Amino acid sequence: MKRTWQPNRRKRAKTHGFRARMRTPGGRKVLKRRRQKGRWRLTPAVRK
Amino acid sequence: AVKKFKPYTPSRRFMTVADFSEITKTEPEKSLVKPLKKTGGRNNQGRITVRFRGGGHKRLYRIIDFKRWDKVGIPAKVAAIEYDPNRSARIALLHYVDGEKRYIIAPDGLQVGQQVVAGPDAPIQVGNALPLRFIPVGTVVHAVELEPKKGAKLARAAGTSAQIQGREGDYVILRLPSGELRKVHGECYATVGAVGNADHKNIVLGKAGRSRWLGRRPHVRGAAMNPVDHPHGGGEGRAPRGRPPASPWGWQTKGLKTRKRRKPSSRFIIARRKK
RNA sequence: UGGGAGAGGGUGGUGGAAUUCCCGGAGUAGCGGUGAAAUGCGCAGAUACCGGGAGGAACGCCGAUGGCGAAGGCAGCCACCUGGUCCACCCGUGACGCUGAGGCGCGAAAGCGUGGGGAGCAAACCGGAUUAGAUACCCGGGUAGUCCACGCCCUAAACG
RNA sequence: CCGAGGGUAGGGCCCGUGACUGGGGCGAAGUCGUAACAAGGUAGCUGUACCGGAAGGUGCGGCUGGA
RNA sequence: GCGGGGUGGAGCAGCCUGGUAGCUCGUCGGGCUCAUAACCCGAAGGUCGUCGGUUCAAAUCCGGCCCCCGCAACCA
RNA sequence: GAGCUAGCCCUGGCCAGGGUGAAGCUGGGGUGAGACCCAGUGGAGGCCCGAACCGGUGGGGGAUGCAAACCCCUCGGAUGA
RNA sequence: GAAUGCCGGCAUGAGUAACGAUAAAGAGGGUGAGAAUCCCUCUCGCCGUAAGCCCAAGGGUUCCUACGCAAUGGUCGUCAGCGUAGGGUUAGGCGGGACCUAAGGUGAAGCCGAAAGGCGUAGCCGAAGGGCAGCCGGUUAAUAUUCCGGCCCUUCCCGCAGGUGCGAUGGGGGGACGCUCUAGGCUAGGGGGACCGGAGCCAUGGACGAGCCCGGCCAGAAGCGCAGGGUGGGAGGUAGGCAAAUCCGCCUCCCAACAAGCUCUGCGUGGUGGGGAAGCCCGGGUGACAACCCCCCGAAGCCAGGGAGCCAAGAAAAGCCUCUAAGCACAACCUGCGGGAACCCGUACCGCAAACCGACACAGGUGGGCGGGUGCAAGAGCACUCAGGCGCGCGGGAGAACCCUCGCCAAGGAACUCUGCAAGUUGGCCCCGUAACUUCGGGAGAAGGGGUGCUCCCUGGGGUGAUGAGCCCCGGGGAGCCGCAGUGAACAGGCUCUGGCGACUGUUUACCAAAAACACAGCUCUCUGCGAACUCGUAAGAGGAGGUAUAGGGAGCGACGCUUGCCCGGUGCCGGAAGGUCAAGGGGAGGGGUGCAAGCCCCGAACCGAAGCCCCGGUGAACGGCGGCCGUAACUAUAACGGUCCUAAGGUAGCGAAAUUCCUUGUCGGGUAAGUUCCGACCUGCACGAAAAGCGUAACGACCGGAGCGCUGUCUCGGCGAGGGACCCGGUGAAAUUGAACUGGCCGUGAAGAUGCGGCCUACCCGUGGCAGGACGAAAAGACCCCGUGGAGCUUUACUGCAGCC
RNA sequence: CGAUGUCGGCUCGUCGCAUCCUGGGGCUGAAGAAGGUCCCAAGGGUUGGGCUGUUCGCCCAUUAAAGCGGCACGCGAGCUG
Ligand SMILES: [K+]
Ligand SMILES: [Mg+2]
Ligand SMILES: [Mg+2]
Ligand SMILES: [Mg+2]
Ligand SMILES: [Mg+2]
Ligand SMILES: [Mg+2]
Ligand SMILES: [Mg+2]
Ligand SMILES: [Mg+2]
Ligand SMILES: [Mg+2]
Ligand SMILES: [Mg+2]
Ligand SMILES: [Mg+2]
Ligand SMILES: [Mg+2]
Ligand SMILES: [Mg+2]
Ligand SMILES: [Mg+2]
Ligand SMILES: [Mg+2]
Ligand SMILES: [Mg+2]
Ligand SMILES: [Mg+2]
Ligand SMILES: [Mg+2]
Ligand SMILES: [Mg+2]
Ligand SMILES: [Mg+2]
Ligand SMILES: [Mg+2]
Ligand SMILES: [Mg+2]
Ligand SMILES: [Mg+2]
Ligand SMILES: [Mg+2]
Ligand SMILES: [Mg+2]
Ligand SMILES: [Mg+2]
Ligand SMILES: [Mg+2]
Ligand SMILES: [Mg+2]
Ligand SMILES: [Mg+2]
Ligand SMILES: [Mg+2]
Ligand SMILES: [Mg+2]
Ligand SMILES: [Mg+2]
Ligand SMILES: [Mg+2]
Ligand SMILES: [Mg+2]
Ligand SMILES: [Mg+2]
Ligand SMILES: [Mg+2]
Ligand SMILES: [Mg+2]
Ligand SMILES: [Mg+2]
Ligand SMILES: [Mg+2]
Ligand SMILES: [Mg+2]
Ligand SMILES: [Mg+2]
Ligand SMILES: [Mg+2]
Ligand SMILES: [Mg+2]
Ligand SMILES: [Mg+2]
Ligand SMILES: [Mg+2]
Ligand SMILES: [Mg+2]
Ligand SMILES: [Mg+2]
Ligand SMILES: [Mg+2]
Ligand SMILES: [Mg+2]
Ligand SMILES: [Mg+2]
Ligand SMILES: [Mg+2]
Ligand SMILES: [Mg+2]
Ligand SMILES: [Mg+2]
Ligand SMILES: [Mg+2]
Ligand SMILES: [Mg+2]
Ligand SMILES: [Mg+2]
Ligand SMILES: [Mg+2]
Ligand SMILES: [Mg+2]
Ligand SMILES: [Mg+2]
Ligand SMILES: [Mg+2]
Ligand SMILES: [Mg+2]
Ligand SMILES: [Mg+2]
Ligand SMILES: [Mg+2]
Ligand SMILES: [Mg+2]
Ligand SMILES: [Mg+2]
Ligand SMILES: [Mg+2]
Ligand SMILES: [Mg+2]
Ligand SMILES: [Mg+2]
Ligand SMILES: [Mg+2]
Ligand SMILES: [Mg+2]
Ligand SMILES: [Mg+2]
Ligand SMILES: [Mg+2]
Ligand SMILES: [Mg+2]
Ligand SMILES: [Mg+2]
Ligand SMILES: [Mg+2]
Ligand SMILES: [Mg+2]
Ligand SMILES: [Mg+2]
Ligand SMILES: [Mg+2]
Ligand SMILES: [Mg+2]
Ligand SMILES: [Mg+2]
Ligand SMILES: [Mg+2]
Ligand SMILES: [Mg+2]
Ligand SMILES: [Mg+2]
Ligand SMILES: [Mg+2]
Ligand SMILES: [Mg+2]
Ligand SMILES: [Mg+2]
Ligand SMILES: [Mg+2]
Ligand SMILES: [Mg+2]
Ligand SMILES: [Mg+2]
Ligand SMILES: [Mg+2]
Ligand SMILES: [Mg+2]
Ligand SMILES: [Mg+2]
Ligand SMILES: [Mg+2]
Ligand SMILES: [Mg+2]
Ligand SMILES: [Mg+2]
Ligand SMILES: [Mg+2]
Ligand SMILES: [Mg+2]
Ligand SMILES: [Mg+2]
Ligand SMILES: [Mg+2]
Ligand SMILES: [Mg+2]
Ligand SMILES: [Mg+2]
Ligand SMILES: [Mg+2]
Ligand SMILES: [Mg+2]
Ligand SMILES: [Mg+2]
Ligand SMILES: [Mg+2]
Ligand SMILES: [Mg+2]
Ligand SMILES: [Mg+2]
Ligand SMILES: [Mg+2]
Ligand SMILES: [Mg+2]
Ligand SMILES: [Mg+2]
Ligand SMILES: [Mg+2]
Ligand SMILES: [Mg+2]
Ligand SMILES: [Mg+2]
Ligand SMILES: [Mg+2]
Ligand SMILES: [Mg+2]
Ligand SMILES: [Mg+2]
Ligand SMILES: [Mg+2]
Ligand SMILES: [Mg+2]
Ligand SMILES: [Mg+2]
Ligand SMILES: [Mg+2]
Ligand SMILES: [Mg+2]
Ligand SMILES: [Mg+2]
Ligand SMILES: [Mg+2]
Ligand SMILES: [Mg+2]
Ligand SMILES: [Mg+2]
Ligand SMILES: [Mg+2]
Ligand SMILES: [Mg+2]
Ligand SMILES: [Mg+2]
Ligand SMILES: [Mg+2]
Ligand SMILES: [Mg+2]
Ligand SMILES: [Mg+2]
Ligand SMILES: [Mg+2]
Ligand SMILES: [Mg+2]
Ligand SMILES: [Mg+2]
Ligand SMILES: [Mg+2]
Ligand SMILES: [Mg+2]
Ligand SMILES: [Mg+2]
Ligand SMILES: [Mg+2]
Ligand SMILES: [Mg+2]
Ligand SMILES: [Mg+2]
Ligand SMILES: [Mg+2]
Ligand SMILES: [Mg+2]
Ligand SMILES: [Mg+2]
Ligand SMILES: [Mg+2]
Ligand SMILES: [Mg+2]
Ligand SMILES: [Mg+2]
Ligand SMILES: [Mg+2]
Ligand SMILES: [Mg+2]
Ligand SMILES: [Mg+2]
Ligand SMILES: [Mg+2]
Ligand SMILES: [Mg+2]
Ligand SMILES: [Mg+2]
Ligand SMILES: [Mg+2]
Ligand SMILES: [Mg+2]
Ligand SMILES: [Mg+2]
Ligand SMILES: [Mg+2]
Ligand SMILES: [Mg+2]
Ligand SMILES: [Mg+2]
Ligand SMILES: [Mg+2]
Ligand SMILES: [Mg+2]
Ligand SMILES: [Mg+2]
Ligand SMILES: [Mg+2]
Ligand SMILES: [Mg+2]
Ligand SMILES: [Mg+2]
Ligand SMILES: [Mg+2]
Ligand SMILES: [Mg+2]
Ligand SMILES: [Mg+2]
Ligand SMILES: [Mg+2]
Ligand SMILES: [Mg+2]
Ligand SMILES: [Mg+2]
Ligand SMILES: [Mg+2]
Ligand SMILES: [Mg+2]
Ligand SMILES: [Mg+2]
Ligand SMILES: [Mg+2]
Ligand SMILES: [Mg+2]
Ligand SMILES: [Mg+2]
Ligand SMILES: [Mg+2]
Ligand SMILES: [Mg+2]
Ligand SMILES: [Mg+2]
Ligand SMILES: [Mg+2]
Ligand SMILES: [Mg+2]
Ligand SMILES: [Mg+2]
Ligand SMILES: [Mg+2]
Ligand SMILES: [Mg+2]
Ligand SMILES: [Mg+2]
Ligand SMILES: [Mg+2]
Ligand SMILES: [Mg+2]
Ligand SMILES: [Mg+2]
Ligand SMILES: [Mg+2]
Ligand SMILES: [Mg+2]
Ligand SMILES: [Mg+2]
Ligand SMILES: [Mg+2]
Ligand SMILES: [Mg+2]
Ligand SMILES: [Mg+2]
Ligand SMILES: [Mg+2]
Ligand SMILES: [Mg+2]
Ligand SMILES: [Mg+2]
Ligand SMILES: [Mg+2]
Ligand SMILES: [Mg+2]
Ligand SMILES: [Mg+2]
Ligand SMILES: [Mg+2]
Ligand SMILES: [Mg+2]
Ligand SMILES: [Mg+2]
Ligand SMILES: [Mg+2]
Ligand SMILES: [Mg+2]
Ligand SMILES: [Mg+2]
Ligand SMILES: [Mg+2]
Ligand SMILES: [Mg+2]
Ligand SMILES: [Mg+2]
Ligand SMILES: [Mg+2]
Ligand SMILES: [Mg+2]
Ligand SMILES: [Mg+2]
Ligand SMILES: [Mg+2]
Ligand SMILES: [Mg+2]
Ligand SMILES: [Mg+2]
Ligand SMILES: [Mg+2]
Ligand SMILES: [Mg+2]
Ligand SMILES: [Mg+2]
Ligand SMILES: [Mg+2]
Ligand SMILES: [Mg+2]
Ligand SMILES: [Mg+2]
Ligand SMILES: [Mg+2]
Ligand SMILES: [Mg+2]
Ligand SMILES: [Mg+2]
Ligand SMILES: [Mg+2]
Ligand SMILES: [Mg+2]
Ligand SMILES: [Mg+2]
Ligand SMILES: [Mg+2]
Ligand SMILES: [Mg+2]
Ligand SMILES: [Mg+2]
Ligand SMILES: [Mg+2]
Ligand SMILES: [Mg+2]
Ligand SMILES: [Mg+2]
């Protein structure tokens, strides 16, 4: 049947993207945390 | 009048539509229409704030002239009478001798080719706009400003009217469509005659789908819900109210008066409404 | 051809009396109602009186034993549209007449549908009395309805 | 081929009968009231509507075969 | 299983707060009427479901027995 | 977190074929004029039958499955809310 | 040594289940260490509104070639979407950007919020919508509207010529619109040809034929032809389109108006350039100087901004045209010609799937376009089949039980069962015919019947043409032939009578309920006078609504019909400038502390003092509620009637053993041989009843009852047959479970149901196919029940707060 | 209670005997036939339907008879639901 993951490059970049994170207080804290942990990627990969 | 149908489907049995007798133009004036923004009953937060709305036919908004003292002394000819999907009343097209073109709501008995005018000096003829104080007591009137120059706010619905009952100082007394007796300022404009398309209330939608065309989504009873949703929710099998009938938000809905008591306009309402 | 009387019919308008309600004023101990009373209304200011406003319905005197219409029926006043009818004149047509099973139309009230309207009145209904009882007569309330528009119903002591 | 008629399917009219039900007629001395005939004790009758154990009552209009 | 009841012939007061049984109808005698009803004047009739106790005293307060209506009997 | 799902907003797209035959219009009859009747024309509809499409009624299978909801037979809607 | 402990390792079940659609395989040749599995050939089967082809998401080198086979591939592997390496994606015209706006997002001005932030007109962003210039062939192992060839085109810059009042982010026009139906003319596509081109072919009885088989076009500027779209011309006035305006709008006047003209598209033709089959030789070459013609069918596509009807009344903005404003008129713009200039990103390959979403090379899910032919009434349905693509990545045998999917069945025909569940039956089209009832539509496909193939003859109407021939499409009337049977295969209703419920089409518990539930038109009550009520928000601001009482919110009821009675004492809501109580505050009789005092400080009664409550009314389609006992009629029985207690008032109409009735399978009637169900009645209604509506109701229903006909493997009662498994052999090889085990019956015993204890009986050791009685078998720390001063959702006249409102 | 699936049907039986039938007896208010009642006897037999989920029961048509109980109200790693 139809499952829950339905990949969409525009959807992905607009929702979890770097610029969407940077605009919001909670989003900036996300970036701050993933940088603190040493995450190699701060943001989901997407070919745009 | 009202058009019936033969019962050739279960719904055509009761469905009635307008005769559209008085309509003379089938498409609007391009310069006078702007796009209507459908809300679905959602405010700027995007929350439903008026329930059960959305999904109706697309409409264009016809810009209506509710001032009219805009162009005092400049007569206009009635070019056409048109369908307006944004209101119950029909609308009439005015070509002013100015060359300006405007929409007003069409009063009853208004006829295409006739002449209408607005101003203190205007003739008491259906389709003419005057400040209230210059209109003879007793004549029926519509599109009434509530306050000077603020726009026609009263009696715009199909078939409605207000009647002038008398005067007091800078104020006249109107009997509104509701039967309320109210003081409205003398310099408030109004159009003489009543709004047309009085047969509008005789319309039987006929099937669920017609409500759906009008953008009205199905209304689900409080009694059909669960306690988390509504005071009338829950109960094993059907239940009576079991409390004074209430809204989803819990306030009483059978007789609880709701107009603010200390309202400034209370000084101007003589007698609360009719039936 | 010329004339006459009339609440004949339809439409639109319009006048004053009365009732009810509302607002103001003045004023206080009851009003109302009956056979007698009670219910009811009234010191939260009623009734009675004066001014103001709204609304509906019916048209006093003229008015008659009168008039008109085929009947049912039609009554303030004005205008418009329309029916019947009588008289005169002795002008025209030349029996073109009478009646009429069917059909068609009209048809008081009550009643019914949709929409208005709603003062007074008032089935149902409530209450107060009477009464052995009183699902009545009498009294105080009161909803349809009575009024308007459109469409039904098609009845009668529709009787001379 | 037609064909008595047999058979299948569906209709129409009539007749008898049916738990129960509806009023009607009748029936020497039942119960409740007293509607009508005298102004019958609220004049009656009436078409219609609503109501009531019952006759009836009331509304609206009509008739006199009442005053 | 828990609650309220039993009192002239019928339907109900009085019990709670111990002493003293009352109301409407019915019934009996008398009146009015030609007569009956209605109406009017008078009267009779309970010994309080029973037994047991508390008390100077029990319709009444307390207990059992007899009956009369009622509410209840749920989880599977 | 509304890339599932629920509702709404904007902009696009899709619905084989067949069937039934409303209003209207035309002609005719009818009448004082009407209502109205008849035929043709017409092509309405949360109309009918049925693919795509959207479903998920009954049964059977499957049940460490092909699948953490599937498969077969049947069945609902299919110009509309 | 235990914690259903934690991490790891290794066992058991076990050579067991399985190896992923039952579309299917066989042989020959080749490669190689090795071949059912790779390559080639032939033969067979499968899809063909796809299982073929193109595009878009998404994926990201998976593409092509060489060399490989440890692992990945459910087996094998020499093969591969796998390993290593090399190569491969070419644009002014295709898509997106250097253009436009939609929702929405953002946001100069401005508003609001403790902070973070929320909002917000313009403007900006935002596309699969608007706008815009490329078609055909060739070429590579792999790219192509991109490279190449032919023929076309766009914008920008500069120049020359001509022309003009040039000039815009401003004005105006246009862009610019729905649904259903649909005309004319074309094209895409397709069928036929006795015509044209073509290798060949004559078989096995016949045919050297008007035989068979193959093919018969594509693109194309200007001009031209056909079909359509768009569009009036002139003049005068002018105050309107926030400046101006000759434009647009409005008024007047002359001319022409299904025309014409001007214009713009489509199709046709068109210089030119391409392509070009079968077959036969080795993707290629030949065919071949290939031919490239006529007739018919014909779109849902094109002309398109076409037309008609309808109501629910159907984006915006730029490109573009016109008007003018500063400006500037040696400029500028328009037109024609010329030269120059023209950037960034994508482009491989998969793409209904083995490369996307599903942990898998997973029977599931995934938007758009093309989708051939014949026949069956039509069609994207069904069967076959073209092009193209496949046989689904374990096989070989055997021919048990049993399981699944399937076929048939004597006599009977629902006797099966909770139930005809399931499976039969019926089944398309044409014709005849079709009941109660009804809201006149319907009920209707009612029911029930007849016809259906092929051949010959006669004939009627239409389309295209030409009015004829031909081809094509509707038909009608004779006469015949064959079979068991002519919608001969496949696709394709069983029907009826009668109840309950819901009017209806719809909607729902994704993944155990589709229903009588929700919704629904419709009815009523109620609130709301607009800065509305109401809703979201601390607010600003929004929705309501650019609406205005014929409107908007809330509630109940639920098409329609006939109806909806009585109670206002309690609660609710509404009305009530009296009275009563009532907080802060006002008031300050009167005390108190301190000080030597002036003073400072403190308490403080009467009385004035809102809403709310009390109190007086109203109010039922507001919350709700609508009695008991005793007696009475000339047979009995019953009680129209009466008595009395209580109530705020005692249930009206209509219904009733009911989706409601306990007693209960009530009783009577119907149907049956027999009826706890069903239908019709009765009425002591345990415990119906009037908008939590009452009683009916045509039509509708994958709803739930009862019955009959039809027909059946449901059954009496089973039998046989088919394939996929089960079985056997080669290959690969799990699982939950498992204290250890050397794990028998009876009667006892035992924590009360013993393989394990006692006594007795029985029993050589080990497997395989089977069946399920036991191992209180497995699975899940019972979801019932209780316990915990455990938790959560929900209610209220529980408590106590808070929002909100007064 | 770190689970012993719970009615009825179906399928499959097996056992008890307080025996429904069949066989053998005594007593009889046993004439015969047919019954009544008790004793012995478990080898075999013990039907098909209507109604209801039903077990049971009633009913229809039969029959030699239409037994009653146990087996976790026998039997859901056997089916139904
Ligand atoms: K329970
Ligand atoms: Mg998916
Ligand atoms: Mg995307
Ligand atoms: Mg996208
Ligand atoms: Mg997106
Ligand atoms: Mg982002
Ligand atoms: Mg790094
Ligand atoms: Mg992140
Ligand atoms: Mg209608
Ligand atoms: Mg119609
Ligand atoms: Mg109308
Ligand atoms: Mg109109
Ligand atoms: Mg515009
Ligand atoms: Mg917003
Ligand atoms: Mg937001
Ligand atoms: Mg709302
Ligand atoms: Mg809404
Ligand atoms: Mg309108
Ligand atoms: Mg105003
Ligand atoms: Mg005012
Ligand atoms: Mg109207
Ligand atoms: Mg609703
Ligand atoms: Mg519910
Ligand atoms: Mg919630
Ligand atoms: Mg609540
Ligand atoms: Mg409730
Ligand atoms: Mg409920
Ligand atoms: Mg209930
Ligand atoms: Mg008011
Ligand atoms: Mg006073
Ligand atoms: Mg003469
Ligand atoms: Mg006559
Ligand atoms: Mg009449
Ligand atoms: Mg009348
Ligand atoms: Mg008397
Ligand atoms: Mg008379
Ligand atoms: Mg015969
Ligand atoms: Mg009398
Ligand atoms: Mg009388
Ligand atoms: Mg009398
Ligand atoms: Mg009389
Ligand atoms: Mg009575
Ligand atoms: Mg009366
Ligand atoms: Mg007389
Ligand atoms: Mg007492
Ligand atoms: Mg005598
Ligand atoms: Mg006496
Ligand atoms: Mg003593
Ligand atoms: Mg004693
Ligand atoms: Mg005593
Ligand atoms: Mg004593
Ligand atoms: Mg005492
Ligand atoms: Mg009880
Ligand atoms: Mg409970
Ligand atoms: Mg239980
Ligand atoms: Mg979504
Ligand atoms: Mg999404
Ligand atoms: Mg669309
Ligand atoms: Mg469709
Ligand atoms: Mg069709
Ligand atoms: Mg026709
Ligand atoms: Mg149609
Ligand atoms: Mg349909
Ligand atoms: Mg689905
Ligand atoms: Mg299904
Ligand atoms: Mg089935
Ligand atoms: Mg199964
Ligand atoms: Mg499952
Ligand atoms: Mg399936
Ligand atoms: Mg269908
Ligand atoms: Mg269709
Ligand atoms: Mg739609
Ligand atoms: Mg230990
Ligand atoms: Mg474990
Ligand atoms: Mg642990
Ligand atoms: Mg192992
Ligand atoms: Mg095993
Ligand atoms: Mg397995
Ligand atoms: Mg498998
Ligand atoms: Mg072979
Ligand atoms: Mg191999
Ligand atoms: Mg090998
Ligand atoms: Mg293979
Ligand atoms: Mg090969
Ligand atoms: Mg095909
Ligand atoms: Mg991937
Ligand atoms: Mg390998
Ligand atoms: Mg290998
Ligand atoms: Mg190897
Ligand atoms: Mg290697
Ligand atoms: Mg492997
Ligand atoms: Mg391998
Ligand atoms: Mg695999
Ligand atoms: Mg090799
Ligand atoms: Mg490549
Ligand atoms: Mg190029
Ligand atoms: Mg540039
Ligand atoms: Mg842009
Ligand atoms: Mg932009
Ligand atoms: Mg954006
Ligand atoms: Mg943009
Ligand atoms: Mg775009
Ligand atoms: Mg482009
Ligand atoms: Mg081109
Ligand atoms: Mg210019
Ligand atoms: Mg527009
Ligand atoms: Mg558009
Ligand atoms: Mg339409
Ligand atoms: Mg055409
Ligand atoms: Mg072409
Ligand atoms: Mg063809
Ligand atoms: Mg040749
Ligand atoms: Mg001007
Ligand atoms: Mg200007
Ligand atoms: Mg050559
Ligand atoms: Mg815009
Ligand atoms: Mg200048
Ligand atoms: Mg110069
Ligand atoms: Mg020019
Ligand atoms: Mg650049
Ligand atoms: Mg490419
Ligand atoms: Mg696709
Ligand atoms: Mg593919
Ligand atoms: Mg693939
Ligand atoms: Mg993958
Ligand atoms: Mg996942
Ligand atoms: Mg595979
Ligand atoms: Mg797959
Ligand atoms: Mg067909
Ligand atoms: Mg295969
Ligand atoms: Mg396979
Ligand atoms: Mg095998
Ligand atoms: Mg074998
Ligand atoms: Mg088979
Ligand atoms: Mg058979
Ligand atoms: Mg049968
Ligand atoms: Mg049979
Ligand atoms: Mg049966
Ligand atoms: Mg059944
Ligand atoms: Mg069949
Ligand atoms: Mg068939
Ligand atoms: Mg009919
Ligand atoms: Mg048939
Ligand atoms: Mg043949
Ligand atoms: Mg069918
Ligand atoms: Mg029933
Ligand atoms: Mg339902
Ligand atoms: Mg339904
Ligand atoms: Mg119903
Ligand atoms: Mg109904
Ligand atoms: Mg309904
Ligand atoms: Mg579900
Ligand atoms: Mg669920
Ligand atoms: Mg299911
Ligand atoms: Mg359904
Ligand atoms: Mg409904
Ligand atoms: Mg209704
Ligand atoms: Mg809020
Ligand atoms: Mg707005
Ligand atoms: Mg509004
Ligand atoms: Mg509902
Ligand atoms: Mg309801
Ligand atoms: Mg009816
Ligand atoms: Mg009350
Ligand atoms: Mg009250
Ligand atoms: Mg009250
Ligand atoms: Mg105080
Ligand atoms: Mg107060
Ligand atoms: Mg008696
Ligand atoms: Mg009751
Ligand atoms: Mg009553
Ligand atoms: Mg019963
Ligand atoms: Mg009953
Ligand atoms: Mg029964
Ligand atoms: Mg009941
Ligand atoms: Mg029972
Ligand atoms: Mg029975
Ligand atoms: Mg019977
Ligand atoms: Mg019955
Ligand atoms: Mg009874
Ligand atoms: Mg209720
Ligand atoms: Mg109610
Ligand atoms: Mg029906
Ligand atoms: Mg249904
Ligand atoms: Mg349905
Ligand atoms: Mg259904
Ligand atoms: Mg069988
Ligand atoms: Mg086999
Ligand atoms: Mg297997
Ligand atoms: Mg392996
Ligand atoms: Mg394991
Ligand atoms: Mg051992
Ligand atoms: Mg051993
Ligand atoms: Mg024991
Ligand atoms: Mg034992
Ligand atoms: Mg042992
Ligand atoms: Mg042991
Ligand atoms: Mg021992
Ligand atoms: Mg032993
Ligand atoms: Mg033994
Ligand atoms: Mg076992
Ligand atoms: Mg087994
Ligand atoms: Mg076991
Ligand atoms: Mg489990
Ligand atoms: Mg635990
Ligand atoms: Mg536990
Ligand atoms: Mg558990
Ligand atoms: Mg327990
Ligand atoms: Mg506690
Ligand atoms: Mg404790
Ligand atoms: Mg707790
Ligand atoms: Mg919580
Ligand atoms: Mg409020
Ligand atoms: Mg347990
Ligand atoms: Mg365990
Ligand atoms: Mg367990
Ligand atoms: Mg014997
Ligand atoms: Mg014997
Ligand atoms: Mg014997
Ligand atoms: Mg035996
Ligand atoms: Mg035995
Ligand atoms: Mg039974
Ligand atoms: Mg029983
Ligand atoms: Mg026998
Ligand atoms: Mg015997
Ligand atoms: Mg068991
Ligand atoms: Mg037991
Ligand atoms: Mg058992
Ligand atoms: Mg069992
Ligand atoms: Mg089971
Ligand atoms: Mg069982
Ligand atoms: Mg088990
Ligand atoms: Mg077991």
From which experimental method does this structure derive?
Answer: X-ray
DSSP state letter for B49: S
Q: What is the SS3 assignment for B233-247?
A: CCCCCCCCCCCCCEC
Q: How far is the CA of B52 from the C1' of G552 (A)?
A: 13
Nucleotide G521 C1' to residue B53 CA (A): 17
* Closest of B125, B90, B110, B56 to residue B199, by C-alpha: B90
Between CA B116 and CA B191 the distance in angstroms is 10
Taking each continuous run of H as one helix and of E as one strand, the counts in chain B are 1, 17
DSSP assignment string, B51-119 = SSB--PPP-EEEP--S--GGGTT--EEEEEEE--TTSSS-EEEEEETTS-EEEEEPBTT--TT-EE-BS
A21: DSSP letter: H
Q: Which nucleotide is nearest to A25 (CA to C1')?
A: G116
Residue B260 Cα to ligand 183 midpoint, Å, equals 52
Q: Strand F nucleotides below 7 A of a protein CB?
A: 1-5, 7-11, 22-23, 44-47, 69-70, 80-81
Q: What is the distance in angstroms measured between the alpha-carbon CA of B108 and the sugar C1' of G239?
A: 31
Q: Two tokens at B166?
A: 């008398």
Question: Resolution in A for the shown PDB structure?
Answer: 2.6
Q: Which sign does the torsion angle of CA B55, B61, B66, B67 carry?
A: positive
Which nucleotide C1' is nearest B181 CA?
Answer: G529
B10 CB-side CA count, 13 A: 3
Nearest Cα to Cα of residue B100 among B29, B14, B180: B29
**What token pair was written down for A6?**
């339905």
Round to whole Å and give the CA distance between B116 and B102. 12
Please give the Cα distance from B198 to B33 (Å, whole number). Answer: 25
Q: How are the residues of chain B apportioned to helix, strand and coil, as percentages rounded to the nearest 5?
A: 10, 25, 65
| Through-space separation of residue B25 CA and nucleotide G476 C1' in angstroms | 54
Tell me which residues have their CB within 5 A of the ion that is ligand 5: A 10-11
Whole-angstrom CA distances from B186 to B117, B134, B145, B170, B173 are 19, 8, 10, 5, 9
